Amino acid sequence: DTICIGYHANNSTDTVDTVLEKNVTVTHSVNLLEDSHNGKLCKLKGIAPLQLGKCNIAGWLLGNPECDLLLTASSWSYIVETSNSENGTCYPGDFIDYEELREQLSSVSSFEKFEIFPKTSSWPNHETTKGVTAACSYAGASSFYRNLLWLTKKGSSYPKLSKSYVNNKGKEVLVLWGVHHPPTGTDQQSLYQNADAYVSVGSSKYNRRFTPEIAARPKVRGQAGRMNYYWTLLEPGDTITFEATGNLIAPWYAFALNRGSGSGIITSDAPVHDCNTKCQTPHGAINSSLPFQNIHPVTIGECPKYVRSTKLRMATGLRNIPAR
Amino acid sequence: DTICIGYHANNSTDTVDTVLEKNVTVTHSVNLLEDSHNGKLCKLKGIAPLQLGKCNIAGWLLGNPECDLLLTASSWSYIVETSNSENGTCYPGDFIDYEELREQLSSVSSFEKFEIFPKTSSWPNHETTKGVTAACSYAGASSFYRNLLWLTKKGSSYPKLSKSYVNNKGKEVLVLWGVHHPPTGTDQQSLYQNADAYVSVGSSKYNRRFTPEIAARPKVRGQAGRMNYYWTLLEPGDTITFEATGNLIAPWYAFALNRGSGSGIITSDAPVHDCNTKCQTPHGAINSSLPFQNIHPVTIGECPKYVRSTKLRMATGLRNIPAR
Amino acid sequence: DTICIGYHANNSTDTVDTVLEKNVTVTHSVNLLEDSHNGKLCKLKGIAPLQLGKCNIAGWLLGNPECDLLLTASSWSYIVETSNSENGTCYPGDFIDYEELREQLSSVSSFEKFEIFPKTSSWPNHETTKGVTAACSYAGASSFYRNLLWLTKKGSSYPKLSKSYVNNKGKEVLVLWGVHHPPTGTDQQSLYQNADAYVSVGSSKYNRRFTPEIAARPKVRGQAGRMNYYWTLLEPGDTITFEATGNLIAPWYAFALNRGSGSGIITSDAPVHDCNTKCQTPHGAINSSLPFQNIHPVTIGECPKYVRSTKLRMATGLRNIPAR
Amino acid sequence: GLFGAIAGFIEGGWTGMIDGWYGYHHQNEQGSGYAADQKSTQNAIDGITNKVNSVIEKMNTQFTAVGKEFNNLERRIENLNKKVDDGFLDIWTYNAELLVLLENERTLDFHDSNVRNLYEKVKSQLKNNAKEIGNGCFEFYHKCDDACMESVRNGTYDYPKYSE
Amino acid sequence: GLFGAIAGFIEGGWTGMIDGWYGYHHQNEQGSGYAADQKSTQNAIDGITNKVNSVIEKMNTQFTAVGKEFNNLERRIENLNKKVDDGFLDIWTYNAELLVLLENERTLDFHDSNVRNLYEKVKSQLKNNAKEIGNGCFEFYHKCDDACMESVRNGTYDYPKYSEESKLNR
Amino acid sequence: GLFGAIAGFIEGGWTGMIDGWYGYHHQNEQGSGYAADQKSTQNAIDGITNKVNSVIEKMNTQFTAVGKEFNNLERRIENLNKKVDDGFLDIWTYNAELLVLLENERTLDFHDSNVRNLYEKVKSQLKNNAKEIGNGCFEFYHKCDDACMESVRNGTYDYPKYSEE
Ligand SMILES: *[C@@H]1O[C@H](CO)[C@@H](O[C@@H]2O[C@H](CO)[C@@H](O)[C@H](O)[C@H]2NC(C)=O)[C@H](O)[C@H]1NC(C)=O
Ligand SMILES: *[C@@H]1O[C@H](CO)[C@@H](O[C@@H]2O[C@H](CO)[C@@H](O)[C@H](O)[C@H]2NC(C)=O)[C@H](O)[C@H]1NC(C)=O
Ligand SMILES: *[C@@H]1O[C@H](CO)[C@@H](O[C@@H]2O[C@H](CO)[C@@H](O)[C@H](O)[C@H]2NC(C)=O)[C@H](O)[C@H]1NC(C)=O
């Protein structure tokens, strides 16, 4: 008559690592590393992401002709740019503080686009038509941004213009505009009619006076002239005043912003699908309660901590010895 | 006849945590987490902190009228702003590289204020009086910064001015100034008289030119005009030269700086008290030899490492088992 | 008869530290901390480092007269500045975005220097000699940078100049230039002859206009005028256009750049020797397969992780007890 | 084995006992069979479960983390940002993998200790009434039936002794 | 515990022994009483004292740490600065809490080992001259008086002296 | 000693046994001498070797790492950049030293456990055929020769017994 003390065993082929010994088959173990995603860009809290397609942030906000699909956009859970998002600034020039603007949009969940300076009403003594360029062509014909208005001289006359907007929206208003810099004095006169002009912008915290820098430069998209793009966040109750004797690319449409946290801009060629998740990555969505993942550093929502590890298996059972 | 082997026990109700088990009562233990502060802003090495009160750094250094108590300030262990430090820049405008200036002040332990360009002697051909504004009112009357001098044209004339100062001190001299930006050209001429003014500031390492940015703006504290504020650190022996044909808010008082390490600016509504410490935090002072604290990330002096932990108790004795 | 179980021992005096006890003599141990260097600046992958000597990056790239040894330089494994690298900008002024330039040179392994605008060919209607100064003397005579050309008026006439360069190098081309700012309007006329001159520089992504800022600053190296230096990375196929009516310190020699990773700039007074390594520090070279080093944080090549530790010895044997 | 029990003086494990981690075998006049020890198997399950939950507790989930853009004159700042990201990544990867290695060692030794302790609880219960063979087996002198066997795997043995 | 001594084959502790961590309770014709073991208690104190000091050494005190301000056009830089502060905080909290949990496990197992080792030091001195009861107690066969007891908690017990034991042993 | 073998019930070690970490000393009618136990010394060498390799694996080498320059209006960024270098350095110095301290404790205990296990492997082989003295010694009752000695330090003892007891 005997009694023996012994331990459990099974057919488990799971292996863990120790400091003294690698590949130690054990009876039980949990994987702490999530490496399985969705291959799809999903909604977040019911709200779908905003695909910019071939357009980038600049194109979407300025109103680049190739981005007319986004004119409808108003709310999103995050912002997606692709590898083919190159339609932004069609007329060559510098978008001042562009990187900071993107950063601002990263904490914007939605907005109400509105006609800040109505193209037909706001410019009696100036010429609102005829403000197009071959570098912003659409349907094979010259066009321009949908949110900006390129003002020009009305019959060899460009009187000083003055136009103010008061923010009665209860939110920040994002106001974009542009200043144009022709290649020759000949062009300056034929566009504005004043040889020496200026644009001035002033709010409660903004104040500048732009003067056209007329020079000859390498043609970009057929254009030897340059056009610089500016923006500002107009606070509730604040006023923004525009004055110009030429070279003003006027604000036509503006955006009343709504702030929210957890939003961001990612780059992804993954397809958007009618799907929902609490953790999104550029590779795809993640459904997991694990502490770690090796899918992607870029994350939106609630996600496992990213890590370079290929394997993170923590043993729970004992060394497995079937000894058959 | 017998002898038993065993271990200690007591009435201790201290509990610690292990990886396998929680709340394990033990005979002896030490707390490594300091969570008790003073509730008071104390001295540091005998020297008291400088309380700005309803003033911020801008108000203090420019000499905003509401900050006249600070005119006495000369030495401090660290600087304190409060939730009501909003009296700074009383004439609307930008303080250029303002955050960088606050960083500089963090390694300053004391200074000597001095009249760099004496008001009564420095400006024979310009008007030194009259340089006041409602936006900097004081005692029901219009006033202006104490450390700055608003120069205008002596009845119909603004001769080109040129004033230099050699740094004969043993230390850095913090020079501040400002450039005024009227709303219109009419104004530019009622104040300066040159419609094309410039301000030229230069030393051996500083060289900058300021042109008035005339534009139509909203009123801020009753003023459409704006004022940008500037500063530079004049090295020992170096010379700073001011040149202007208008728009210069000249330096009146400067500061000879004394460098020192272990200081900084904090935000706190805690009261200052006649007491001393080696570790100060926005919430209160800390008198501890413990390695950790969960009171505040912001620290001044010699402090325990900050941490989010609520409990950091390390076991020294063994498991406690009275077994009565 | 008997049989005894026991363990090994020897004359080893190696000690390790544990959490419970310090200085525990063990039988076997490995050192993990490398603290021995070479005291020399060696080559990396066969290629010798570039020793700047008494010159810094600005002096090297601009062609300061005290850096003529560096004219030959073309390839390097890494760049070395010494404690006496002060010869750089010899005419007083600001090197715009200088720190950014240094950052760019860190990933450059070699370049082909070339005559982008040949001194004797490029400027028929301007004076190419006579552009020297006592602040940049060499061999007792007034001189100037080797890579820049100081254009002046050709007998009371300074015609608007226009000069372009198309980048046909299949590489990035680093182009440096300068804009001069005289002390007086008289000096402006004697040098340029146009009172209201301007310099204009433009490429596909660069666009900036410079106007002379005339004023008297403290003399630096005898000079009361200032010269501002500018650079830009011209992309393959792209074109840069210079246009000016004065004050242009034109480019003479430019650099076609070859990118490469693993390079950088270090400060060291250690001598360069005919020697080869895989790991270089400002103190000297390292030949080790250990995981850690406490020699220096700055590293070039493949090095052990830097660490403040004085001692990192890991026990392999057992507690050593000779008990003689 | 740090405690010389598992893969030590008990050469192998039993594929046959499927009720728990530690247990007994027992051969009797009434028959053979396996039986797992609830007491000791449970504590190991409470302890291991707690270890796993504690590990997961220290590793807080990562929230919204996107990338920033920088213009061509912001290379130093872009490189600072990159040094920060790569940096924290090196450390968390290190902490993660390293914690698992160490804890895995502790866990295997934990079980090893649990078996060794069980064996010795019995050995000090039987004493003379049984002889220690090998493989942690106890050959009874006083011949124990199924009802008595349950007193052993129970801690309520009882002692009636002769020899032997 | 990990060594089956504390809360193991010695079910409970002694609120009655206040001189140290480990010790003895010997009962005699002269009387009862507790007595702590200096040798083993001091080595535990020296090691635990050393453990705590080692932990504090690795955690260097924090010097002057203030916050930086940023203007409305430096949101990227401000967020970079925040990420670093939050990042370094996540790591030091993790390390602090995690180091304690781990060393707490070790310390408790350290005491457990010490009791087990003390028990087995005595057991190997006595051998025949006493029988192991259970709760870590030894019942003597040969009778040990106060003076003899002190030679056991002293590492100088004399076996041979004691085949009297061989007599009472049956 | 966490397992009470080394510096414990086996007071000291042998400067005489130079073949391995753990071993035996026999003493026979044919003579004395030392002999290392291959089986257990190798496993310890495999485990320790693997431990040291595992530590070096987690500590990735450092590639090119130079410094950055900043102008006098970039103090905040210069301080950010310096806080990041000092910060990471604080952590890696902590990790390195602290990992060593801990594993060193484990390694000494590992050897300890090895000696304790080797001893109890022999103890359960002999049983009656020898009495336990001290210092992990076994006094045989049946008197064993060099040929039988080698069966002990081999795991094949085999119990021709007859008790002179
Ligand atoms: C929208 O994006 C596409 C892709 O960049 C632009 O197409 C390029 O236009 C340039 C200039 O005419 C050509 O030299 C390239 O060959 C075109 N690339 C491709 C891939 O077709 C297009 O012009 C952009 N349109 C607008 C309005 O921005
Ligand atoms: C000093 O600060 C106080 C309070 O921050 C300022 O008072 C405010 O002034 C504005 C503009 O006139 C009013 O709209 C608010 O109602 C005032 N608030 C309070 C609490 O009084 C004051 O004007 C500042 N003065 C100076 C000289 O800077
Ligand atoms: C190169 O550097 C040296 C040293 O920095 C310069 O020489 C100094 O010039 C200053 C200003 O004229 C004098 O006050 C010092 O006495 C000089 N020091 C030495 C050691 O010579 C030199 O002029 C520089 N030359 C160029 C072309 O940059």
From Swiss-Prot, chain D:
It comes from the Viruses. Glycans are attached at residue 154. Disulfide bonds join 144-148. This is Hemagglutinin HA2 chain. The lineage of its organism: Viruses, Riboviria, Orthornavirae, Negarnaviricota, Polyploviricotina. The gene is HA. The chain holds residues 345 to 508 of 566 of the full protein.
